[PDB]
Coordinates of C-alpha atoms and ligand atoms in Angstrom, one line a residue:
X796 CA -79.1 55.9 59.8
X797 CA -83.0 55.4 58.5
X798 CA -84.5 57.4 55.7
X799 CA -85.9 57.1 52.4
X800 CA -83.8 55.3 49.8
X801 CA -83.3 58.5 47.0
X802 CA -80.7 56.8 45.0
X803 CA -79.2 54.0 43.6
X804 CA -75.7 53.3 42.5
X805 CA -74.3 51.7 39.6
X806 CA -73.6 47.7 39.7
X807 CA -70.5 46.7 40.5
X808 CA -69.5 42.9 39.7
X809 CA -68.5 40.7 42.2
X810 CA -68.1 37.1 40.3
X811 CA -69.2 35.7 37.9
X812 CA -70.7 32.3 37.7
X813 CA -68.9 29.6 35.0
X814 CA -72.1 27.6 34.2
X815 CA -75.5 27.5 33.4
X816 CA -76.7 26.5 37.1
X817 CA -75.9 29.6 38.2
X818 CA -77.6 31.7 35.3
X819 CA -80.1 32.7 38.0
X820 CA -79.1 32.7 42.1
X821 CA -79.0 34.3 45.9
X822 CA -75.7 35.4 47.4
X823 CA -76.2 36.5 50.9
X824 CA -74.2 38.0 53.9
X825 CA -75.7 37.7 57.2
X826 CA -76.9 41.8 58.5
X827 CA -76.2 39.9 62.4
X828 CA -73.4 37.0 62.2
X829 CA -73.1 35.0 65.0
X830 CA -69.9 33.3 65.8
X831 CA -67.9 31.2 64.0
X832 CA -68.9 33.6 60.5
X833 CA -68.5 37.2 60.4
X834 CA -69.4 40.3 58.2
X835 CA -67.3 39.2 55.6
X836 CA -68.9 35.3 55.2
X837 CA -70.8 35.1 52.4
X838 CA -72.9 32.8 50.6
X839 CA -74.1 31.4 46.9
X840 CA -76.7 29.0 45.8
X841 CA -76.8 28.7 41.9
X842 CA -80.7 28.0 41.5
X843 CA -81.0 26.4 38.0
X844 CA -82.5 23.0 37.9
X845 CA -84.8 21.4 40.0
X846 CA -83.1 19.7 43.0
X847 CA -80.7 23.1 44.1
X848 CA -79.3 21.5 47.4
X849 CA -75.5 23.5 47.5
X850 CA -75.0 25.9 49.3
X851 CA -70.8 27.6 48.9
X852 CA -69.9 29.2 51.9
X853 CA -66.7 31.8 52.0
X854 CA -65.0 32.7 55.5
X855 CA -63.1 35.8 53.5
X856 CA -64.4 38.3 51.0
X857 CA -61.1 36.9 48.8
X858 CA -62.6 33.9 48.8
X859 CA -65.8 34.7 47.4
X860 CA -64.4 36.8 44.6
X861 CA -61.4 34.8 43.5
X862 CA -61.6 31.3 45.0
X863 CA -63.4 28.2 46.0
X864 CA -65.6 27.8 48.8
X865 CA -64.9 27.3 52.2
X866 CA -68.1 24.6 53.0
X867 CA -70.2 23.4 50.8
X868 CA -73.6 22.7 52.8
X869 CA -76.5 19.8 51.3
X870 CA -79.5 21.4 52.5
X871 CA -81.4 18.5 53.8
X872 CA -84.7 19.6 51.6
X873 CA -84.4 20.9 48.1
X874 CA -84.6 25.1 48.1
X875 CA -87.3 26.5 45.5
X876 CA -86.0 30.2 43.5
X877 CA -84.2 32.8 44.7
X878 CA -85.6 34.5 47.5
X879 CA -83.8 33.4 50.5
X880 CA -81.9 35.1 52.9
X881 CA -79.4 34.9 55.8
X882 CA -80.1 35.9 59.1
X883 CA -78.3 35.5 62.6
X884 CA -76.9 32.2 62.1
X885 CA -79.5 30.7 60.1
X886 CA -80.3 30.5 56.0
X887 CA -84.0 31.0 55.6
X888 CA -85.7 29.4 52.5
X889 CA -88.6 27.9 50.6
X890 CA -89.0 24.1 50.4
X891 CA -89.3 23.5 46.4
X892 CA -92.5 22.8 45.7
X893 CA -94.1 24.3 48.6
X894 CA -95.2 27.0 50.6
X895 CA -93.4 26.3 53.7
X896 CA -90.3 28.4 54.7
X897 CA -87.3 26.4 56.5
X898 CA -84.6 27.8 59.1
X899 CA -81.8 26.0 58.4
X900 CA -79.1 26.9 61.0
X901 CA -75.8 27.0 59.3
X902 CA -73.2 26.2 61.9
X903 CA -75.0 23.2 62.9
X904 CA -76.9 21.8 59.6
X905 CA -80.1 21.7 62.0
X906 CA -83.4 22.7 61.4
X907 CA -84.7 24.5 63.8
X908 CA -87.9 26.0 62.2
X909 CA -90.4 25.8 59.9
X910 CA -93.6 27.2 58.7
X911 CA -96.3 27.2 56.4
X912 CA -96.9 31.3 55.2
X913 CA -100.4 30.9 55.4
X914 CA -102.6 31.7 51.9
X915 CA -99.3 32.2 49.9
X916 CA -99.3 31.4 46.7
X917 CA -96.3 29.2 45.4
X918 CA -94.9 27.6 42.2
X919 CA -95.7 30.0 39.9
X920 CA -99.0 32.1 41.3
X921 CA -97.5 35.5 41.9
X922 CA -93.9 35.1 40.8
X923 CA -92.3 38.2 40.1
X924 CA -92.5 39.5 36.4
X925 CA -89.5 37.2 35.5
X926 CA -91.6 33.7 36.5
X927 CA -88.8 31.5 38.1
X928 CA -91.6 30.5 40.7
X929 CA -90.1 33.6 42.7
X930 CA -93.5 33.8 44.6
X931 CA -91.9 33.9 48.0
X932 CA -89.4 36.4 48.3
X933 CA -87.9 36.8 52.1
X934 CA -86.3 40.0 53.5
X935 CA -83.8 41.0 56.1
X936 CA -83.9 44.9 57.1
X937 CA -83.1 46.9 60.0
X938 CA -86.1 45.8 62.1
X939 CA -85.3 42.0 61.5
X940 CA -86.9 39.3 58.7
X941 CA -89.9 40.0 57.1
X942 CA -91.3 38.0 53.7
X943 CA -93.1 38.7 50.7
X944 CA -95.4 37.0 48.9
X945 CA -99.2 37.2 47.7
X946 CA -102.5 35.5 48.7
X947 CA -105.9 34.8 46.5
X948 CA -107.4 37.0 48.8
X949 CA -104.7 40.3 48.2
X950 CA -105.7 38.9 44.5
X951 CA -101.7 39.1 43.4
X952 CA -101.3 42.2 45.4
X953 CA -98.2 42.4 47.8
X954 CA -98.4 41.1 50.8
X955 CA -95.8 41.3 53.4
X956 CA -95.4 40.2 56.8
X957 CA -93.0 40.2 59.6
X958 CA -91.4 37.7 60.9
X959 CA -90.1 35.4 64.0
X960 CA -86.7 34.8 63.3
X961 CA -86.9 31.7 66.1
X962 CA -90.3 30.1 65.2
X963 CA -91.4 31.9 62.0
X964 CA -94.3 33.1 63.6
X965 CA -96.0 36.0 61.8
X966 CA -96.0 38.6 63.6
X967 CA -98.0 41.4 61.5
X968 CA -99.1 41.9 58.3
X969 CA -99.6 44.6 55.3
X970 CA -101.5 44.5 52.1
X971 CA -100.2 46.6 49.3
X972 CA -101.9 47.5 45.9
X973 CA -98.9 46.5 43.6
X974 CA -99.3 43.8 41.9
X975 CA -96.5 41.4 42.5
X976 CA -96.4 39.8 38.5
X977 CA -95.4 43.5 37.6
X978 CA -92.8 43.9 38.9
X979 CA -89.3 42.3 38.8
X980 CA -88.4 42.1 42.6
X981 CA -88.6 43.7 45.6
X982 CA -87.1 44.6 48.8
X983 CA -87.1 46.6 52.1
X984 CA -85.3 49.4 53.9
X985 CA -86.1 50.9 57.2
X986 CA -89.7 49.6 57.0
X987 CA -90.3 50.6 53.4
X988 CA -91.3 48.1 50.2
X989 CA -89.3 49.0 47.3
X990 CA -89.8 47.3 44.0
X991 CA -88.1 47.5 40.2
X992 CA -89.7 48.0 37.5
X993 CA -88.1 46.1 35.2
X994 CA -85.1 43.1 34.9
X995 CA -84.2 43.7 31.5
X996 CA -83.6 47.3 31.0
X997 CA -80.8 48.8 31.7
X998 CA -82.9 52.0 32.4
X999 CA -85.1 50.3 34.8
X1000 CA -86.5 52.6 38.1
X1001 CA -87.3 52.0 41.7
X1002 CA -91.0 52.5 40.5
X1003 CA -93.3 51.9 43.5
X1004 CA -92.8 52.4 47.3
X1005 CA -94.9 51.3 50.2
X1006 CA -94.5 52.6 53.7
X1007 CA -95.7 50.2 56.7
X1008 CA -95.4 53.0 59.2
X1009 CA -98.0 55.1 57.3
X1010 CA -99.4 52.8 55.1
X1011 CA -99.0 55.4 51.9
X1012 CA -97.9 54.0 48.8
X1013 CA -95.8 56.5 46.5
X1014 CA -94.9 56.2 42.7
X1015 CA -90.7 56.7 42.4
X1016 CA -88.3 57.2 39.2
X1017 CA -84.9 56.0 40.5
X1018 CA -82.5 54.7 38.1
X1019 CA -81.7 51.3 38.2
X1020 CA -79.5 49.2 36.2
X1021 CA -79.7 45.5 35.1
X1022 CA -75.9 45.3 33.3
X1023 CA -76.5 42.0 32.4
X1024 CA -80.0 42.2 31.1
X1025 CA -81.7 39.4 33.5
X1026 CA -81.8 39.9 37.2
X1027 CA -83.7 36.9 39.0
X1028 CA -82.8 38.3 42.9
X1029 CA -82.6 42.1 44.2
X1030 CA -82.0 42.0 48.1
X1031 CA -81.0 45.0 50.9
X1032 CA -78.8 44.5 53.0
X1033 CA -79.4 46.7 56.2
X1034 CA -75.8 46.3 57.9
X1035 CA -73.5 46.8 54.3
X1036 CA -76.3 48.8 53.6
X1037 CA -76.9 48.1 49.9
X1038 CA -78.7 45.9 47.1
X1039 CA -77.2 42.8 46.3
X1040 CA -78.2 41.2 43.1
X1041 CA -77.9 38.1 40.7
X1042 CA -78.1 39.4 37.0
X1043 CA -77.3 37.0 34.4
X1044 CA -75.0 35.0 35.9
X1045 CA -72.9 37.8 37.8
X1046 CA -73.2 38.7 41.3
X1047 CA -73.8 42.0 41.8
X1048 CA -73.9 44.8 44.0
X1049 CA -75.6 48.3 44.4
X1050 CA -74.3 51.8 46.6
X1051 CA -77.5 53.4 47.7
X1052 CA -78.5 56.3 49.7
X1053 CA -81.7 57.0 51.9
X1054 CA -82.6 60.7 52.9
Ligands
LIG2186 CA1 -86.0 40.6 46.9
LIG2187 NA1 -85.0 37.6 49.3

């Protein structure tokens, strides 16, 4: 069920992190889990500091709300910000300190994949309006993985370009007019950019929306909520269908609906 997103929910809290590593983070379930995880596995990463390695796996929803983790993975390379995503079996993520993404399968702690996105800036170029070196933002929607991120030549603009989930190939690109350092994050539904406008405010909006189908960009008012006053990572996820977010330590989530 595609259509345009006309409405966002309030947050609803999830957990809450104990300590200042996970002031700012991803938590991620996987829109197409492949055996042994399921809809309900979920992952965390904390992301303060400058070696972020751990990665907390969760079999069971429970878990993830009210207990320890499962796993704990060492990713083999350390992971810059918090714009990773899970996908079909693998975490996708950005080597710190690079411009290379990295598909790290999960069940096997192999990687299978990796890949320069080519002309991306990184480490601070086109972060999000937050900093945090958010530059690279990927994206899981109904069509598959995509990622986000700006060149010299989009001059900050957003780019965006779908992906290969096998071999990260890029498989077609788009070059908005929104300037990625104004806005706080960004994500996708049903072939559509969405981005918020602000991760302070608890009156933020859905501000600006850019079509791939048609190419048309639209300016949008929907409320949206930062409770916490300092969201680092706004995600869809296309199978829950809803935002997930990190905001100030607490792990968040958002009911939408698309017309
Ligand atoms: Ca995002
Ligand atoms: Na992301």
């Amino acid at each position: 069920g595609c259509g345009e997103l006309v409405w966002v929910g309030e947050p609803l809290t999830l957990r809450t992190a104990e300590t200042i590593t996970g002031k700012y983070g991803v938590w991620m379930r996987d829109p197409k889990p492949t055996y042994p995880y399921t809809q309900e596995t979920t992952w965390r990463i904390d992301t303060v500091g400058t070696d972020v390695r751990q990665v907390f796996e969760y079999d069971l929803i429970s878990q993830f709300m009210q207990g320890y983790p499962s796993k704990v993975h060492i990713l083999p390379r350390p992971l810059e910000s918090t714009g990773a995503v899970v996908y079909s079996g693998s975490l996708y993520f950005q080597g710190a300190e690079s411009r290379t993404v990295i598909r790290y399968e999960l069940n096997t702690e192999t990687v299978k994949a990796e890949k320069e996105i080519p002309g991306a800036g990184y480490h601070g170029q086109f972060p999000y309006s937050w900093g945090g070196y958010t530059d690279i933002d990927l994206a899981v929607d109904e069509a598959g993985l995509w990622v986000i991120y700006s060149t010299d030549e989009a001059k900050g603009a957003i780019v965006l370009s779908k992906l290969n989930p096998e071999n990260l190939e890029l498989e077609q690109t788009w070059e908005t007019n929104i300037r990625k350092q104004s806005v706080a994050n960004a994500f996708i539904i049903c072939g559509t950019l969405y981005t918020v406008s602000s991760y302070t405010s608890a009156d933020a909006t859905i501000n600006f929306a850019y079509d791939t189908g048609t190419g048309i960009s639209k300016t949008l008012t929907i409320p949206f909520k930062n409770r916490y006053k300092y969201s680092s990572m706004i995600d869809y996820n296309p199978l829950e269908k809803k935002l997930f977010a990190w905001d100030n330590l607490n792990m968040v989530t958002y009911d939408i609906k698309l017309s």
